[PDB]
Amino acid sequence: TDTIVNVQGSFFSASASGVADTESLLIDPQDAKFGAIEIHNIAHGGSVDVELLTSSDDTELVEDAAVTLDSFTGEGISQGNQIEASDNTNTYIRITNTSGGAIDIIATGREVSQ
Amino acid sequence: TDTIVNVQGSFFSASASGVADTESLLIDPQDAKFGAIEIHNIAHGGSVDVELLTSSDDTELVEDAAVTLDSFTGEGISQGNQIEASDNTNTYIRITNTSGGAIDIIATGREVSQ
Amino acid sequence: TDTIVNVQGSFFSASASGVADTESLLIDPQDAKFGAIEIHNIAHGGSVDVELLTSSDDTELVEDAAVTLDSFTGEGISQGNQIEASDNTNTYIRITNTSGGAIDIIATGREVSQ
Amino acid sequence: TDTIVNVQGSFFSASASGVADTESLLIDPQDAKFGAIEIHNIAHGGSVDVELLTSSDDTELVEDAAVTLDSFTGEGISQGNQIEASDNTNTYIRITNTSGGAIDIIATGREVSQ
Amino acid sequence: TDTIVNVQGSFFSASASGVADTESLLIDPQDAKFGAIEIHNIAHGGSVDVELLTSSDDTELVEDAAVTLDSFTGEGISQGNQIEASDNTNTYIRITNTSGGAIDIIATGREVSQ
Amino acid sequence: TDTIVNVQGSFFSASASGVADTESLLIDPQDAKFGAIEIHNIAHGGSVDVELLTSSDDTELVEDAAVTLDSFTGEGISQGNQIEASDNTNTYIRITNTSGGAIDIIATGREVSQ
Amino acid sequence: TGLNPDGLGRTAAFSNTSAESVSAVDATIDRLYAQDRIEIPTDSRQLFSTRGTVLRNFEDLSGWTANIGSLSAETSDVYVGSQSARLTASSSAVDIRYSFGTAQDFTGKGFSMALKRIDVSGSSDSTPIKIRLVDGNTNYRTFSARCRPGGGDEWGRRDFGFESEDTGFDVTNVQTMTVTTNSRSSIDILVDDIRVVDSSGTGQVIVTIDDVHTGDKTAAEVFGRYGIPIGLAANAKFLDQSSSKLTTQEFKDLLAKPHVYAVNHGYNHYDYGSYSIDEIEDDVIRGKYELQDLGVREPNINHYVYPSGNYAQESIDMLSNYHVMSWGTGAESFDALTPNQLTSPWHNLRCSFDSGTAEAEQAVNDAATYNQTAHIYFHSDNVTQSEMESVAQTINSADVTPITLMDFYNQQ
Amino acid sequence: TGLNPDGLGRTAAFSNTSAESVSAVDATIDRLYAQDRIEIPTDSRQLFSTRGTVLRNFEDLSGWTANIGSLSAETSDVYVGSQSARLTASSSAVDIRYSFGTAQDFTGKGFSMALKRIDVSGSSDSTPIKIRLVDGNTNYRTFSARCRPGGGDEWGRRDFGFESEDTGFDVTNVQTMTVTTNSRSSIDILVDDIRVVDSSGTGQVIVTIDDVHTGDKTAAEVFGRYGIPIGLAANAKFLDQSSSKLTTQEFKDLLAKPHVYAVNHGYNHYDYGSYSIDEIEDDVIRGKYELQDLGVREPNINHYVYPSGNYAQESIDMLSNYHVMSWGTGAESFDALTPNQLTSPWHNLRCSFDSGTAEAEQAVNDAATYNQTAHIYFHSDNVTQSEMESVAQTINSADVTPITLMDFYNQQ
Amino acid sequence: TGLNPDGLGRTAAFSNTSAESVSAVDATIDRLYAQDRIEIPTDSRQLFSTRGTVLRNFEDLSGWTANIGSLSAETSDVYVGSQSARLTASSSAVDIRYSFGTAQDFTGKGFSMALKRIDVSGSSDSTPIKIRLVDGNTNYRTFSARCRPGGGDEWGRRDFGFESEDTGFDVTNVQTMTVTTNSRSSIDILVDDIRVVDSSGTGQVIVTIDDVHTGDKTAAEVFGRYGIPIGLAANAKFLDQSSSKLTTQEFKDLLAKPHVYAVNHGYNHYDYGSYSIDEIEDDVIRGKYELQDLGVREPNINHYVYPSGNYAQESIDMLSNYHVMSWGTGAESFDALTPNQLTSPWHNLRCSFDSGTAEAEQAVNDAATYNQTAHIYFHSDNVTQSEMESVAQTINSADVTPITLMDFYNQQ
Ligand SMILES: [Mg+2]
Ligand SMILES: [Mg+2]
Ligand SMILES: [Mg+2]
Ligand SMILES: [Mg+2]
Ligand SMILES: [Mg+2]
Ligand SMILES: [Mg+2]
Ligand SMILES: [Mg+2]
Ligand SMILES: [Mg+2]
Ligand SMILES: [Mg+2]
Ligand SMILES: [Mg+2]
Ligand SMILES: [Mg+2]
Ligand SMILES: [Mg+2]
Ligand SMILES: [Mg+2]
Ligand SMILES: [Mg+2]
Ligand SMILES: [Mg+2]
Ligand SMILES: [Mg+2]
Ligand SMILES: [Mg+2]
Ligand SMILES: [Mg+2]
Ligand SMILES: [Mg+2]
Ligand SMILES: [Mg+2]
Ligand SMILES: [Mg+2]
Ligand SMILES: [Zn+2]
Ligand SMILES: [Zn+2]
Ligand SMILES: [Zn+2]
């Protein structure tokens, strides 16, 4: 039988340094080559709210559905997520600072096919 | 040996903003390209009942078997599901609002082959 | 290197509405295209016993080995299973009603190669 | 990019009805097409000891290394295993009855390449 | 249908013996053939802080975003991680000794496609 | 779309019968066809220390970094590991007897691509 | 993290896990953050049953005279020993009498008896059962308890409250004791094991308020004027339902007062006989955790009060997993009253002052005089402020210590 | 292993799991291996508040005469009832007097009062507050407690230690009682709810040693000579820090002695006001688990001693999740002293003999004479062996039972 | 579900999990369903060691006269203080005497002493050790305990049972105290810390039955005839083994009786010295959980009884993680007997009536007379019904309260 070596699909990340008190990292699957993402890690330099949004617009965020998924307190990593978003389903992930001061946010995961 | 990069299979989502008190998001695998789905995430803007239904009809929901899978209270994400539905087996997932007010529901997952 | 999109293998389900008090859904891997199945979900409309059986006959169930795997009480979903059965190894999964009344049973999973 | 549907690799099972008090099911990876196995499930109709053995002989079990992995009490399923054996590494899995009476044993899993 | 044997994608490791008290192993995804990594294991010969950094520079670490992910105490293994880094997104993982003495650090995982 | 059956990548094992009191099984990824390994199972016939080592030499073990990963007491199986080693990164896994008497050690897992 | 634990099946080494529900056969926890217990380790059902000494044994019925009704040995349905006594009557009371060989001194002794109701019918399906002590001059002191359906369906101990005394009764010169009932068309009740306990301590009062009505605020002020502890028998569902009920903040503010404490009354007041044991168990469990979220902690939340006073051994068995003690309802002075040492923490009643303060005030005066514990209760919608003041002044002026249920159970 | 549990979300059936941290809403455990509790089910804050009976009520201030200072009703900031009393003075003490309608007998009675400090200023931001009993011959017996910032910031009960007595005082013939302070430029303090408790039992002594100095070894020998229990208020971080502190092995060796026990003092001695409540909580939690690893167990490790004696209701609220009882610091005999029945396990002080043994020895003699509990303390670096011996001989020769903190709390 | 918890390593957010075994460092549980504890938070080993007051400290041996044998200071192997006493004899008893400076009154005082056996040899490797009070007329009152291997291998406290009295002994006029042994070829025993406890309360009796023989059914009837509580020292493996043992249903039926309770005796009766500490620990743990499945709950299942009476400090240390109290075996009246206040919950014996009722009946009469607690025991296969009746009638007619082990430990 044929042997093939499987290397895992395209790495995805979004990051922002010095996100101000109530500002946010908008993770947009439009930035993915495949147009969909699965975020595995959220490294949070301080407290954040994670929010999943559907847009009315194909290309810009105009809030339709919005659900606040979870709140993270202090500094650390939310490892082992599968929060998913795509361009065609107009889904965005917003990570909003709640720390009372400037923080670094790094979100990593994988690109998924639409 | 051959090396191949594996990107993960087609993203699927269903969403509804402002689902009224006793209304529901009907997740229909007919909307999938492959005609079957596996829902991983249910982001629930308030309390919901999740229900798995078989239809008597190939194309429309006429309830045959129905099982209420679980109840979610308040706002959050049911991560790590594998609730599965296909068109050919006429399986539907209904997420019904129970909050006493209007909510946003976002369900995400993956398309599966029939 | 080559990029390929991996969509997941064939959806499988078995279902029965209004299974009477001591009757059962017989999940038969003969109904799978690949002739083997892995059940992930059992949605149980009431109490059930799950049972794994080997047949003496290649095509019909004549009980050889039988093990009662687990008992589920009330309504819900047994998510995240890997109960496995194949035609060639003559393995059947029986989900038997124990509710004291008629129930809906939906089992979902994936076809596996023999 | 190319889309491929991935069906999961060859189902494997070993079973025995009415295994007497101190007798055993010998799971032999020589029975696999690929000559190696990964057992995921042990359905045990009563108490069993699971044992991993290396043979001195390429084709028959003549005990070299033997480790008793675990003891299961009563009836049920050991789901979610990855006990592994191959023909070329002469590895066998023995499931030994300890119930004080005759039991049914069904072990299921997947064939793995050597 | 076609049968293929899937061998898992490229092994990645970074290691350092005798890392002094406040020194660090810089895990750089530039050292990966595919230019991205997912660290699964951190074997820590003593206490360490794990830190995820974005660089301003494409090729050298000049700290932009930095998040201290977690602190490990004493000797052991952090198994089951998915901390991810890529060259193109200029992401580095720093494992910093905090033991009060010299330690061995071994990080293992897998290369991922960008 | 194309359907392919995925059989899982090459089985790997290392074993030793009658390992004396302070002796060890050296698991060497040089013995793998692909030159890297991921150990999933350690079946331990008595107490063992597991240790991850980097060599200074490409082909022989001359200890550079060494971390004692974990200690196992008595007889059993450490199932569900992902301890990883490769030839090119000169990584070895040593399982050292600590029982006070002779034991059987069987380690199983999978070959991984470098 | 470490490597995976020893064993077959799904094994996993984790750093941090979160779960809604965890089931374990065994859990080894190095440091436990679990102040909020639902299921309590203590089984109180039979702890107190053997306290004090057996006075009347019923192993020989020769010492007993049936004055009215009839007395026979029960050898098949026995509480304690080789036999128990069947008390039987048709269209009459039962009165059985034991004459002591020598004068007994029962100063500061409290009385308790094992009881099972087989059948009572007529004017009521229930009777007062009375232990009387009679002196050399034929003066009676009466202590009593209730033989009711539900609570009497299985063998259980009653701890007898003082009821009445003839003037000039000499408790140092007791010549005979009597077990007696009211008159009924049919009586069939089993008795065994009369016990004597030391109750020489000061008299005590417990006050409980049921069902979380808005009037609990005025009650807290009134009983506060004399530092009398109030137990709120709390149903957490009732909070914020209507203007007639406390708000959640008002309830938390009341519990912040040094003399107000909460005890469980079930989330939604599910009483025995109206709901299944499973539904009541859920109500009990939910009541417990909801009150724990409101800050009600261990010694307090180990007490329950029966919704509508309804119970049986079935409910006691279920409740014993969650609570150490529970209280029923009655309307007469002796219903409040127990010796200071209980023999059942499950079968004892409380006296209502919803329908007039006289019996409850009588009970408080009797607790002081006869060295007993009076448990009195009300719903604050049924009682006026001037009635609460009458009761609170009665408690202040009497020789009683007002106490919490926690104090009372810790004394046992 | 079985099949996966009922539910949506990630459900999982496991054999054996290992975790660093587990969070669960519900945990059902068939067999629990969790002897090391951090978070205790018992909330002790208000259990003892209603012990004994209310003597002085303050619901009618007509019975009180302001001898010096001034007295007014507080109807908004009330501990108990409809009102409390505001005691107010400018450049003077406050002395308020209640004459009893009939002579009172206070033999073996202990006094407690509810207190809140609004403002004290002048020589100090604190005052002794004194309950005096005065007899027919105008002899005084004084009991006292401290009205301090922090501990007085919110309503809390003080249990009054004996201070002084006039020769020939007749406790059977008390005609009047006084509440009084020292003189200050400004006084504004609220009082309510004077309570009487039974303290007729033998006198008791508790000895604690703070801060784990090397001199605890000589202390253990000296107090050992007379079998007097020592509580080590232990900070686990301090072990092995320096030659001036116990080693870990020395500490374990001390705890192995039948009369030496440990109580929590926080891992790194974080005191109230110097650190946030969150940092102190972490210190408390870590102190608890580190001492548990050293073998300190349940009844012992349920006690805390405030670092530097600093506390407030904020800290008590936090500590009440982890501990049942805590102790502050004072330098005078009455600071050691409480009735044998407490009404607060949180607000009571200990007397130092770091700066001379006189006050502590006085307290021990007074505990014997007046049937009270004396809590005395020291740092073993401040006290010479001859001083420890003086104190230990004083305890041995006095009519006191030397007791553990565990014993003392189990008595409440 | 939420998102995965903070941290590196394998982290997971679950809804519902099932496990056989969970290991956690920290567990935060919002609502705990874990009534069945294996590990208990309470370490009882040293709680009671300092109760009462030290009478003799042995810190100055000048006050002691060696009448027979020899007395020296032990300054390195010390229980309490600077020194302990070495009692040494060759081919003789040791008798050491302390004359009091003034006549002592020991009415209702119970005696306890610290003991370590270095060497005893001759007729036995053990001795009775006697504390012996002498009045002005040279009448003796003897209290005694046993200096045995195992239980005497390390320092431990014995609580001395009444043994004998000379006619006309005046306990108000005690002039001399004596510590004495039986005669042996070699004696080397260390003593320290004689303690006096208040034991003025009523006499008490505890009855235990070992090893779950079928005769426990007739015992339950017989002791039931007087409401005397029985503890079954239960080995859960023995149930259903043979016709000579209780069935599981019979055992559950016995425990459903108000006067029968169970205590742990290890799953399969593994005794100290016959098995390793690890095997005994497994036996103890399995005994606990199997009895918990049979419905034996917390206060009851916190008691253990040593298999075959075998123990040492090693086994006590292990058992203290699981149980609060344990009992050994003896054959003489004083073996039953302790003061009502213990100083060790681990070193006390029980008196057998397997080989005749005389010593046990003597103990019950002595418990009544001298205000002590008698623990008596039997195996129901060794005892005839008329012997059980003799003992039960003796307990009924004596001035004792028959009590549970739970009651007895809650009194300490
Ligand atoms: Mg779009
Ligand atoms: Mg919205
Ligand atoms: Mg589109
Ligand atoms: Mg269809
Ligand atoms: Mg239906
Ligand atoms: Mg079709
Ligand atoms: Mg077939
Ligand atoms: Mg069969
Ligand atoms: Mg075939
Ligand atoms: Mg072979
Ligand atoms: Mg071997
Ligand atoms: Mg070969
Ligand atoms: Mg770059
Ligand atoms: Mg930064
Ligand atoms: Mg670039
Ligand atoms: Mg190499
Ligand atoms: Mg090294
Ligand atoms: Mg190379
Ligand atoms: Mg009877
Ligand atoms: Mg007031
Ligand atoms: Mg000494
Ligand atoms: Zn109610
Ligand atoms: Zn300090
Ligand atoms: Zn035995």
PDB file of N, CA and C in Angstrom, chain H residues 308-342:
ATOM      1  N   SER H 308       0.382  40.291  62.943  1.00  0.00           N
ATOM      2  CA  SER H 308       0.506  41.575  63.625  1.00  0.00           C
ATOM      3  C   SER H 308      -0.767  42.007  64.366  1.00  0.00           C
ATOM      4  N   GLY H 309      -1.713  41.083  64.588  1.00  0.00           N
ATOM      5  CA  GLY H 309      -2.992  41.371  65.219  1.00  0.00           C
ATOM      6  C   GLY H 309      -3.953  42.217  64.381  1.00  0.00           C
ATOM      7  N   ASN H 310      -3.625  42.494  63.112  1.00  0.00           N
ATOM      8  CA  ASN H 310      -4.425  43.378  62.271  1.00  0.00           C
ATOM      9  C   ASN H 310      -5.618  42.636  61.662  1.00  0.00           C
ATOM     10  N   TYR H 311      -6.819  43.224  61.780  1.00  0.00           N
ATOM     11  CA  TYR H 311      -8.028  42.661  61.190  1.00  0.00           C
ATOM     12  C   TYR H 311      -9.105  43.731  61.022  1.00  0.00           C
ATOM     13  N   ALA H 312     -10.129  43.373  60.237  1.00  0.00           N
ATOM     14  CA  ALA H 312     -11.395  44.080  60.104  1.00  0.00           C
ATOM     15  C   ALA H 312     -12.443  43.079  59.628  1.00  0.00           C
ATOM     16  N   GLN H 313     -13.706  43.507  59.529  1.00  0.00           N
ATOM     17  CA  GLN H 313     -14.778  42.625  59.092  1.00  0.00           C
ATOM     18  C   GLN H 313     -14.511  42.073  57.687  1.00  0.00           C
ATOM     19  N   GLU H 314     -13.870  42.865  56.814  1.00  0.00           N
ATOM     20  CA  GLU H 314     -13.432  42.434  55.486  1.00  0.00           C
ATOM     21  C   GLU H 314     -12.580  41.161  55.549  1.00  0.00           C
ATOM     22  N   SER H 315     -11.583  41.164  56.441  1.00  0.00           N
ATOM     23  CA  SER H 315     -10.691  40.031  56.619  1.00  0.00           C
ATOM     24  C   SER H 315     -11.425  38.862  57.274  1.00  0.00           C
ATOM     25  N   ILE H 316     -12.299  39.130  58.255  1.00  0.00           N
ATOM     26  CA  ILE H 316     -13.081  38.100  58.927  1.00  0.00           C
ATOM     27  C   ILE H 316     -13.949  37.358  57.911  1.00  0.00           C
ATOM     28  N   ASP H 317     -14.606  38.099  57.013  1.00  0.00           N
ATOM     29  CA  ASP H 317     -15.445  37.533  55.967  1.00  0.00           C
ATOM     30  C   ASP H 317     -14.647  36.576  55.081  1.00  0.00           C
ATOM     31  N   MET H 318     -13.466  37.007  54.629  1.00  0.00           N
ATOM     32  CA  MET H 318     -12.574  36.185  53.828  1.00  0.00           C
ATOM     33  C   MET H 318     -12.099  34.950  54.619  1.00  0.00           C
ATOM     34  N   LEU H 319     -11.584  35.165  55.838  1.00  0.00           N
ATOM     35  CA  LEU H 319     -11.060  34.123  56.716  1.00  0.00           C
ATOM     36  C   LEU H 319     -12.110  33.081  57.089  1.00  0.00           C
ATOM     37  N   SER H 320     -13.384  33.482  57.185  1.00  0.00           N
ATOM     38  CA  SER H 320     -14.476  32.594  57.561  1.00  0.00           C
ATOM     39  C   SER H 320     -14.696  31.461  56.555  1.00  0.00           C
ATOM     40  N   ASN H 321     -14.144  31.578  55.344  1.00  0.00           N
ATOM     41  CA  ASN H 321     -14.189  30.489  54.377  1.00  0.00           C
ATOM     42  C   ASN H 321     -13.195  29.381  54.727  1.00  0.00           C
ATOM     43  N   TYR H 322     -12.155  29.707  55.514  1.00  0.00           N
ATOM     44  CA  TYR H 322     -10.968  28.872  55.698  1.00  0.00           C
ATOM     45  C   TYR H 322     -10.780  28.460  57.158  1.00  0.00           C
ATOM     46  N   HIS H 323     -11.209  29.319  58.099  1.00  0.00           N
ATOM     47  CA  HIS H 323     -10.966  29.183  59.531  1.00  0.00           C
ATOM     48  C   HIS H 323     -12.247  29.438  60.319  1.00  0.00           C
ATOM     49  N   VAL H 324     -12.297  28.923  61.556  1.00  0.00           N
ATOM     50  CA  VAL H 324     -13.452  29.073  62.436  1.00  0.00           C
ATOM     51  C   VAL H 324     -13.234  30.166  63.481  1.00  0.00           C
ATOM     52  N   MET H 325     -11.975  30.506  63.765  1.00  0.00           N
ATOM     53  CA  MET H 325     -11.670  31.339  64.917  1.00  0.00           C
ATOM     54  C   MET H 325     -10.350  32.068  64.671  1.00  0.00           C
ATOM     55  N   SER H 326     -10.253  33.310  65.166  1.00  0.00           N
ATOM     56  CA  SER H 326      -9.013  34.068  65.105  1.00  0.00           C
ATOM     57  C   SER H 326      -8.857  35.013  66.282  1.00  0.00           C
ATOM     58  N   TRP H 327      -7.595  35.368  66.504  1.00  0.00           N
ATOM     59  CA  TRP H 327      -7.178  36.084  67.690  1.00  0.00           C
ATOM     60  C   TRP H 327      -6.303  37.272  67.315  1.00  0.00           C
ATOM     61  N   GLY H 328      -6.598  38.417  67.946  1.00  0.00           N
ATOM     62  CA  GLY H 328      -5.790  39.624  67.855  1.00  0.00           C
ATOM     63  C   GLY H 328      -4.802  39.765  69.014  1.00  0.00           C
ATOM     64  N   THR H 329      -4.242  40.972  69.168  1.00  0.00           N
ATOM     65  CA  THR H 329      -3.158  41.209  70.112  1.00  0.00           C
ATOM     66  C   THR H 329      -3.484  42.365  71.056  1.00  0.00           C
ATOM     67  N   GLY H 330      -3.002  42.248  72.300  1.00  0.00           N
ATOM     68  CA  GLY H 330      -3.075  43.301  73.300  1.00  0.00           C
ATOM     69  C   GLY H 330      -1.959  43.149  74.325  1.00  0.00           C
ATOM     70  N   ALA H 331      -1.806  44.160  75.188  1.00  0.00           N
ATOM     71  CA  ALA H 331      -0.676  44.228  76.100  1.00  0.00           C
ATOM     72  C   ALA H 331      -1.100  44.221  77.572  1.00  0.00           C
ATOM     73  N   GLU H 332      -2.412  44.182  77.858  1.00  0.00           N
ATOM     74  CA  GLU H 332      -2.905  44.258  79.230  1.00  0.00           C
ATOM     75  C   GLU H 332      -3.701  43.012  79.598  1.00  0.00           C
ATOM     76  N   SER H 333      -3.805  42.769  80.905  1.00  0.00           N
ATOM     77  CA  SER H 333      -4.359  41.553  81.471  1.00  0.00           C
ATOM     78  C   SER H 333      -5.751  41.230  80.912  1.00  0.00           C
ATOM     79  N   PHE H 334      -6.625  42.240  80.824  1.00  0.00           N
ATOM     80  CA  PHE H 334      -7.984  42.033  80.347  1.00  0.00           C
ATOM     81  C   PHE H 334      -8.047  41.634  78.870  1.00  0.00           C
ATOM     82  N   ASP H 335      -7.014  41.961  78.083  1.00  0.00           N
ATOM     83  CA  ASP H 335      -6.917  41.527  76.695  1.00  0.00           C
ATOM     84  C   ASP H 335      -6.848  40.006  76.569  1.00  0.00           C
ATOM     85  N   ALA H 336      -6.180  39.328  77.513  1.00  0.00           N
ATOM     86  CA  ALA H 336      -6.142  37.871  77.529  1.00  0.00           C
ATOM     87  C   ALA H 336      -7.526  37.271  77.763  1.00  0.00           C
ATOM     88  N   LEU H 337      -8.380  38.013  78.464  1.00  0.00           N
ATOM     89  CA  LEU H 337      -9.452  37.399  79.220  1.00  0.00           C
ATOM     90  C   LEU H 337     -10.769  37.453  78.455  1.00  0.00           C
ATOM     91  N   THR H 338     -11.436  36.299  78.393  1.00  0.00           N
ATOM     92  CA  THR H 338     -12.804  36.201  77.920  1.00  0.00           C
ATOM     93  C   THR H 338     -13.570  35.311  78.888  1.00  0.00           C
ATOM     94  N   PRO H 339     -14.914  35.404  78.941  1.00  0.00           N
ATOM     95  CA  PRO H 339     -15.717  34.334  79.527  1.00  0.00           C
ATOM     96  C   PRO H 339     -15.424  33.023  78.794  1.00  0.00           C
ATOM     97  N   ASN H 340     -15.742  31.909  79.453  1.00  0.00           N
ATOM     98  CA  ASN H 340     -15.523  30.580  78.901  1.00  0.00           C
ATOM     99  C   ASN H 340     -16.423  30.309  77.691  1.00  0.00           C
ATOM    100  N   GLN H 341     -17.580  30.981  77.634  1.00  0.00           N
ATOM    101  CA  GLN H 341     -18.428  31.005  76.453  1.00  0.00           C
ATOM    102  C   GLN H 341     -18.196  32.317  75.701  1.00  0.00           C
ATOM    103  N   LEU H 342     -17.744  32.211  74.451  1.00  0.00           N
ATOM    104  CA  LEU H 342     -17.611  33.357  73.570  1.00  0.00           C
ATOM    105  C   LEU H 342     -18.951  33.692  72.932  1.00  0.00           C
TER     106      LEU H 342
END
